[PDB]
Amino acid sequence: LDQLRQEAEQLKNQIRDARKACADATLSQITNNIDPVGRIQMRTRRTLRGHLAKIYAMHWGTDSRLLVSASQDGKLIIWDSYTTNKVHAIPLRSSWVMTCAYAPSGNYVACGGLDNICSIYNLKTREGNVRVSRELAGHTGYLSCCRFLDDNQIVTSSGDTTCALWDIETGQQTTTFTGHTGDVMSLSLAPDTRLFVSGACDASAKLWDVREGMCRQTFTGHESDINAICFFPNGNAFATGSDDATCRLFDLRADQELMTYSHDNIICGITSVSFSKSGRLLLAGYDDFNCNVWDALKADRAGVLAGHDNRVSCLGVTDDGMAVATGSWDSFLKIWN
Amino acid sequence: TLSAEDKAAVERSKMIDRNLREDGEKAAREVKLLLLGAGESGKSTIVKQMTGIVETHFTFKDLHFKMFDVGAQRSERKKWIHCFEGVTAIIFCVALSDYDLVNRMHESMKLFDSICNNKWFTDTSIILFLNKKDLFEEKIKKSPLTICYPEYAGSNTYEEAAAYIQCQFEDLNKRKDTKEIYTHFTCSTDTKNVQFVFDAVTDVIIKNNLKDCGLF
Amino acid sequence: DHFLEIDKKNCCVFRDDFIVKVLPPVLGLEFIFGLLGNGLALWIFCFHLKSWKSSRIFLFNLAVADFLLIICLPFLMDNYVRRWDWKFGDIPCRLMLFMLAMNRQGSIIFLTVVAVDRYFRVVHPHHALNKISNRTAAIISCLLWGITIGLTVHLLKKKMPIQNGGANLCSSFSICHTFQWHEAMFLLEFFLPLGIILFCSARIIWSLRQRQMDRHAKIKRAITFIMVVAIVFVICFLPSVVVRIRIFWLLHTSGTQNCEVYRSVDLAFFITLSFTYMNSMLDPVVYYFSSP
Amino acid sequence: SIAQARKLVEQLKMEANIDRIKVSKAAADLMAYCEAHAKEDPLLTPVPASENPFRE
Amino acid sequence: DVQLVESGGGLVQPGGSRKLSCSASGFAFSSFGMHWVRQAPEKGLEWVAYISSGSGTIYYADTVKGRFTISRDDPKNTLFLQMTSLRSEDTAMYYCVRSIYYYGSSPFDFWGQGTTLTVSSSDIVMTQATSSVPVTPGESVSISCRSSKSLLHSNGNTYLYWFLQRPGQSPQLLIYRMSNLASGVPDRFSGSGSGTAFTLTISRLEAEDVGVYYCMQHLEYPLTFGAGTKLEL
């Protein structure tokens, strides 16, 4: 049966034709009138040194003061960034962890990794200690990302080519999204927590709807695995970082590639990206041992944060946009401002 | 210039730091091995002799060994292999009885070539185990080794064939001076595989200590 | 003749004519080579280095100890050109003597510590001391410096400069009869560390040979480096001790009344003492930077 | 074996039924949002040390 | 159950050496700084002693310094206070409160039961002015407390705590750091004010709410309580 194969071929050809006919001018042509942002200099304000292995994930609290970090020594550490103090140190059951999350209300944290199980830890207990609230199982591959919708729901992305939306109370997979063809390595929730995006090793990204659970849009254009993704603060665009030493800015409504951030010097991949509060600076962590910042409109480099002696693995920006946190494969976790 | 609660918080943070340092010191004295095979190669026995990752465990000669078996991690190998950088040794298992067909020996050779010549494992030593020797002897009683390897001009005896297989598997190494591999034929005797693993681990530990100070 | 009462009976003290044209050139060559080595070694140890380890801490301590002699050499050649005379003041020469004794003691002690560390790393790979904290290394170094000060602080009490006509030489080694009160340190300073270093080196080489690990090239290179360190230490530290035991035997056999006997022995002893500075200047080359 | 092909056909027919705005309009919208909210970006415009929570 | 029991009371002749024990069950005793707080038979509360987690910090009051000692046993979850050379002014009821300090914690949250002891025959001063207030159900009441030194620290915290003691019971934390509501406290209770002037407001006052209200400062040791405002009818 090749008739339906030809149907798919003609449908994708029509999709390409519609996308091409909807393009009239690039974002660079519009933004060339914007004055250059100028050189951006950032200095290390705080340095948090508690870990003893490679750091694989970190997440900022909602209050822009507390953060949580995960490394390979089987420890989850809660840092008070203002005074570099330690609040909690949670020993993990499985030392292979590749993700971390912080609840918006600040009550729960989440962890996961090569053990195919997402653990949820409760922070505020009458007993005065941190204990594992709930273990979620059902994935057949390693977990690569997990994000909190609220105190009762969670979204997980695994290497079994599928994504899941859970229910912490019952502990069962409320919904499952299956539309990929490779490992899924990233996850970013929209500001209204109604849709989200996922980036896969298939060299593509997809826009999922949480409420009912089917893929609405598929964005392609990369050339290798996608390691990170992040939503624009407006909620109508996102940025993907891949292994071909390039970043890309896609738009939801235009259903098209908007711009590409790449320079001939860089040849190494990208491990994590994030935006700024106003959506003007696009930060990106590379394997070149240093992070870069890009003027998101003109696609010009405007600063390099080089203070790490290994590959930068995690990167985040506070809610008020007053700081940046970078964690590399050396145990140190650095704060820039 | 701090309040009472700030001083108490600082004291709590210091206690947390002390606990972390003690845990790291305790956990820095273990020997971590990574176990790799080719499915039915014979990883069962090496393990039983002593849903994701499956860490086994043992204490031998006052040394704590933790063996990590990936097992059923049916996904991309390059997307999680770098998590295992820094392991003391890689225990590769291969069966001498899988030259019949359905090519299994060639798959094991391809896997060994991929693992040995890797950017992450540029200095981690590999302990090669050749098991299922008795069934290989039974097979070589009648069938020749020419089926898997079309060469010779030598002979069809257990010793020469085993030496040929060992040389072929050692030939796949490319970092001949930054990496050393050890080959052992598994024996039914109790304390022969564990002793060999201990000797290889010691050797790696001596080399690591010499690298630390700088003398080597 | 050449007599002079130091504190007891007398002390045959001499200033040979040739001394002006023997020691100053050797000392200048040592000064310049020690500069060109130590500067680079310390710069790479404080600029281009990785995280501090216990061994690295011990090597840095040894570098401080052998730099203490570099900062004191100019006084030495100033004395040697002026035929054993001071004009720089009392508390000054005393500081020079204290620095010299501190340099010798610290260098020897830290050499023995490094040798013991190597022996424990190669012979006992799974012992506790192989993974030591940086704080423990700091405490050990501080304790070693403290005991070194303990033995060497006696030299900072007596106002040594003695009347010698046109000179007030502040030399710490005179042909005295006296007795091994503070002396015999010059002997124990070398005899015990020689035994410890030789035993550690022999055990390391024999264990690395028996284990059949002498196939990788850098293993043989490290064996040769250990042997070279041993030969350097033995070569630098003996001529002085040989002349010292010879003059001790002469003192015990012949009383210190006929100073005419001690003619060549003073010159020989001081040439050997000049030779002794060779190890301190070779340390920035053999250990740091020549290593793999 | 063959149901995934029908699933892919349905997914393509769903994705081929969404209207898209002009690229220039989207560029102008992103431009306007950035211009409007540039004033509240402490990273974009360095903040004085009086209210900077990270001293020195 | 986070129960917390004390023992070691009774009648002691002056010059005795009575020792009080306090056993805690139901929580991680190892990571909770523990205080000992006394109360006179008719007067208000008065801080007595404090020991931190890990026993690295110990504080005593001025009236008890050199006579009382405090110690912990973490393996068996016990807190001891040894009293020596008892005087006639030490007759009181003792409580074994707990407090854990970190960013966002609520110290003094759980109070003990109380042990009765009888004996035969530069500090921040905080006043509470009015002692008795006539109230009716369904009304709104305000309690005013006033210190002598401003409690607004440089960082921003205002260390002041509001406690409520019901008749025949032990005090329970109501408000910590002058604005934060303790766990299990209804919405009606609220706190406000500024430096050296604080006010606790109860809206829609109802029964099982009368008793005594105390204001305490945590700016610097020794901790000082107020006289206490009493609600009746």
Q: Is C42 helix (H, G, I), strand (E, B) or coil?
A: helix
Structure-token match 């690591």, residue found: B208
Tokens for C108, please give them: 């020897």
Structure-token match 């990574």, residue found: B34
Q: Are residues E26 and E107 in the same domain?
A: yes
From chain E, pick out residues whose CB is under 8 angstroms from the CB of B10: none
User: What's the gap in Å between the CA of B16 and the closest CA on chain C?
Assistant: 18
Question: H helices of chain A, where?
Answer: 3-21, 27-31
Q: Write out the residues of chain E at the interface with chain A, using a CB-CB cutoff of 8 A.
A: 2, 26-28, 31-32, 100, 102-104
Question: H helices of C54-184, where?
Answer: 54-70, 73-81, 90-123, 134-152
Among the partner-chain residues A80, A85, A129, the one whose CB lies closest to the CB of E28 is A129
Q: How far apart are the first and last CA of chain D?
A: 63
H-run or E-run covering C278: helix C264-286
State the sign of the Cα–Cα–Cα–Cα dihedral D24, D30, D35, D36. Answer: positive
Q: Write out the residues of chain B at the interface with chain E, using a CB-CB cutoff of 8 A.
A: 1, 3-9, 11-12, 15
Contact (CB<8Å) A128/E32: yes
Where is chain B broken, named by the residue before each break, C–N > 2.5 Å?
Answer: 50, 102
- C218 and chain B: CB distance < 8 Å anywhere? yes
Contact (CB<8Å) C131/B28: yes
- C292 and chain B: CB distance < 8 Å anywhere? yes
Are A224 and A242 within 8 A, CB to CB? yes
Contact (CB<8Å) A85/B19: no
Q: Are residues E114 and E139 in the same domain?
A: no
Q: Are residues E165 and E215 in the same domain?
A: yes
For residue C150, the enclosing domain spans 17-286
Among the partner-chain residues A80, A85, A128, the one whose CB lies closest to the CB of E28 is A128
Q: Please report, as a single letter, which amino acid is at residue B191.
A: T
Experimentally determined by: cryo-EM
Contact (CB<8Å) E27/A66: no
Are A87 and A79 within 8 A, CB to CB? yes
CA dist., res. A122 & res. A63, Å (int): 18
Cα–Cα separations (whole angstroms), residue D25 to A65, A207, E184: 38, 21, 53
Cα–Cα separations (whole angstroms), residue A131 to A110, A125, E120: 12, 8, 49
CA dist., res. A81 & res. A50, Å (int): 13
Are E189 and E178 within 8 A, CB to CB? no
Q: Is A325 helix (H, G, I), strand (E, B) or coil?
A: strand
User: What's the gap in Å between the CA of B64 and the closest CA on chain C?
Assistant: 11
Interface probe, candidates A6, A83, A322, A335, chain D, greatest D C-beta count within 10 A? A322
Put simply, the chain D residues between 12 and 51 with a CB less than 8 A from any chain A CB are: 12-16, 18, 20-24, 26-31, 33-34, 37-38, 40-44, 47
Is C223 domain-assigned? yes
Residue by residue, DSSP assigns A126-185 as TTSS-EEEEEEE--SS-EEEEEESSSS-EEEEESSS-EEE--TTT-S-SEEE---SS-B-
In the beta sheet, which residues pair with residue A304?
A292
In the DSSP assignment, the letter for residue A92 is: P
Among the partner-chain residues A89, A94, A201, the one whose CB lies closest to the CB of B16 is A89
- Phi then psi for residue B44, to 5 deg, are -50, -65
Structure-token match 């124990």, residue found: C188
Tokens for D19, please give them: 């209207």
Q: How far apart are the first and last CA of chain A?
A: 60
- B214 and chain A: CB distance < 8 Å anywhere? no
Half-sphere exposure of A179 (CA within 13 A, CB side): 24
Cα–Cα separations (whole angstroms), residue B42 to B23, B89, B135, B168, B196: 35, 18, 12, 20, 17
Contact (CB<8Å) A50/B20: yes
Tokens for C199, please give them: 């035993």
CA dist., res. E38 & res. E94, Å (int): 4
CATH T-level assignment (fold) for domain A7-336: Methylamine Dehydrogenase; Chain H (2.130.10)
Is C32 domain-assigned? yes
Among the partner-chain residues B4, B9, B12, the one whose CB lies closest to the CB of E220 is B4
From chain A, pick out residues whose CB is under 8 angstroms from the CB of E103: 65-66, 80, 85, 87
- B27 and chain C: CB distance < 8 Å anywhere? no
CA A257 and chain centroid, separation: 19
CA dist., res. A305 & res. A321, Å (int): 16
User: Chains touching chain E at 3 or more Cβ pairs under 8 angstroms?
Assistant: A, B
Are A223 and A259 within 8 A, CB to CB? no
Is C11 domain-assigned? no
Q: How far apart are the first and last CA of chain B?
A: 50
Instruction: Choose among C278, C276, C271, C273: nearest CA to C18.
Output: C271
Task: Name the percent of chain A in helix, strand, coil, to the closest 5.
Answer: 5, 45, 45
CA dist., res. B155 & res. B36, Å (int): 31
Q: Please report, as a single letter, which amino acid is at residue E165.
A: Q
Cα dihedral C244, C247, C248, C250, rounded to 10, equals 160
CA dist., res. A285 & res. A266, Å (int): 12
Cα–Cα separations (whole angstroms), residue A300 to A36, A119, A294, C31, C98: 9, 41, 6, 54, 63
Half-sphere exposure of B114 (CA within 13 A, CB side): 12
- B51 and chain A: CB distance < 8 Å anywhere? yes
Rounded CA Rg of chain D: 23
Among the partner-chain residues A8, A15, A322, the one whose CB lies closest to the CB of D42 is A322
Q: Which residues of C272-281 are buried (b: 16+ CB within 10 A; e: fewer)?
A: bbbbbbbbbb
User: Chains touching chain D at 3 or more Cβ pairs under 8 angstroms?
Assistant: A
CA dist., res. A91 & res. E13, Å (int): 52
Q: Residue C209 is part of a domain; what is its CATH number?
A: 1.20.1070.10
Three-class SS string for C192-243?
A: HHHHHHHHHHHHHHHHHHHCCCCCCHHHHHHHHHHHHHHHHHHHHHHHHHHH
- A138 and chain B: CB distance < 8 Å anywhere? no
- A114 and chain B: CB distance < 8 Å anywhere? yes
Contact (CB<8Å) B4/E221: yes
Contact (CB<8Å) E103/A87: yes
Residues 6 or more apart whose CB falls under 8 angstroms from that of B166 comprise: B130, B183
Is B215 domain-assigned? no
- B187 and chain A: CB distance < 8 Å anywhere? no
CA dist., res. A9 & res. A88, Å (int): 55
User: What's the gap in Å between the CA of A47 and the closest CA on chain B?
Assistant: 15
Are A102 and A77 within 8 A, CB to CB? no
Where is chain C broken, named by the residue before each break, C–N > 2.5 Å?
Answer: none
User: What's the gap in Å between the CA of E101 and the closest CA on chain B?
Assistant: 6
Are B99 and B143 within 8 A, CB to CB? no
Is B213 domain-assigned? no
CA dist., res. C94 & res. E226, Å (int): 68
Three-class SS string for chain E?
A: CCCEEEECCEEECCCCCCEEEEEECCCCHHHCEEEEEEECCCCCEEEEEEECCCCCCEEECCCCCCCEEEEEECCCCEEEEEECCCCCCCCEEEECCEECCCCCCCCCCCCCCCEEEEECCCCCCCECCCCEEECCCCCCEEEEEECCCCCECCCCCECEEEEEECCCCCCEEEEECCCEECCCCCCCEEEEEECCEEEEEECCCCCCCCEEEEEEECCCCCCCECCCEEEEC
C222-C284-C151 Cα angle (round to 5): 105
In the beta sheet, which residues pair with residue A334?
A47, A326
Are A335 and A45 within 8 A, CB to CB? yes
In the beta sheet, which residues pair with residue A198?
A206
In the beta sheet, which residues pair with residue A102?
A109
Q: Is B184 helix (H, G, I), strand (E, B) or coil?
A: strand
Contact (CB<8Å) A52/B24: yes
- C258 and chain B: CB distance < 8 Å anywhere? no
Instruction: Choose among E33, E23, C281, D21: nearest CA to B5.
Output: E33
Query: What does the longest C-alpha to C-alpha distance in chain C come to?
Result: 67
- Phi then psi for residue A145, to 5 deg, are -160, 150
CA dist., res. D26 & res. A258, Å (int): 9
In the beta sheet, which residues pair with residue A154?
A148
* Domains contained in chain E, number: 2
How many CB atoms sit inside 10 A of residue B180's CB?
18
- Environment class of E52 (CB within 10 Å of its CB; exposed 0-12, middle 13-18, buried 19+): buried
* Domains contained in chain C, number: 1
- A50 and chain B: CB distance < 8 Å anywhere? yes
Are E171 and E108 within 8 A, CB to CB? no
In the beta sheet, which residues pair with residue E49?
E36, E60
Residues 6 or more apart whose CB falls under 8 angstroms from that of A245 comprise: A262, A266, A267, A268, A269, A270, A286
Among the partner-chain residues E2, E31, E104, the one whose CB lies closest to the CB of A126 is E2
Domain coordinates of chain D in residue numbers? Answer: 1-56
- Phi then psi for residue C4, to 5 deg, are -165, 125
From chain A, pick out residues whose CB is under 8 angstroms from the CB of D30: 27, 232, 234, 237, 251, 279, 297
CB pairs below 8 Å between B and C: how many? 50
For residue B196, the enclosing domain spans 26-205
Q: Which residues of B166-177 are buried (b: 16+ CB within 10 A; e: fewer)?
A: beebbeeeeeee
Q: How far apart are the first and last CA of chain C?
A: 57
- Phi then psi for residue A330, to 5 deg, are -75, 155
Tokens for A233, please give them: 């603060």
Q: Please report, as a single letter, which amino acid is at residue A78.
A: I
Cα dihedral B194, B200, B203, B208, rounded to 10, equals -110
Does E have 3 or more CB contacts under 8 Å with B? yes
Contact (CB<8Å) A86/B52: no
Structure-token match 């405490």, residue found: C139
Are A69 and A56 within 8 A, CB to CB? no
CA dist., res. A320 & res. A63, Å (int): 9
Is C23 domain-assigned? yes
Q: Are residues E202 and E106 in the same domain?
A: no
Query: What does the longest C-alpha to C-alpha distance in chain E come to?
Result: 51
Is B173 domain-assigned? yes
Instruction: Choose among C2, C172, C176, C177: nearest CA to C79.
Output: C172
In the beta sheet, which residues pair with residue A69?
A58, A77
Are B13 and A85 within 8 A, CB to CB? yes
- B147 and chain A: CB distance < 8 Å anywhere? no
Residues 6 or more apart whose CB falls under 8 angstroms from that of D30 comprise: A27, A232, A234, A237, A251, A279, A297
Is the link from the previous residue into E222 a cis peptide, with omega within 30 of 0? yes
CA dist., res. A131 & res. C76, Å (int): 70
Q: Residue E188 is part of a domain; what is its CATH number?
A: 2.60.40.10
From chain A, pick out residues whose CB is under 8 angstroms from the CB of E102: 85, 87
For residue E52, the enclosing domain spans 5-119
C244-247 contacts at long range (C-beta below 8 A, 24 or more positions apart):
C244/C186, C244/C187, C244/C269, C245/C187, C247/C175
Q: At what angle do helices C54-70 and C90-123 cross, to 10 degrees?
A: 150
Residue by residue, DSSP assigns C46-71 as HTS--S--HHHHHHHHHHHHHHHHHT
Q: Are strands E132-134 and E229-232 parallel, antiparallel or unpaired?
A: parallel
Q: Residue B83 is part of a domain; what is its CATH number?
A: 3.40.50.300
Cα dihedral B101, B104, B107, B108, rounded to 10, equals -150
Are B75 and A159 within 8 A, CB to CB? yes
State the sign of the Cα–Cα–Cα–Cα dihedral D47, D48, D52, D54. Answer: positive
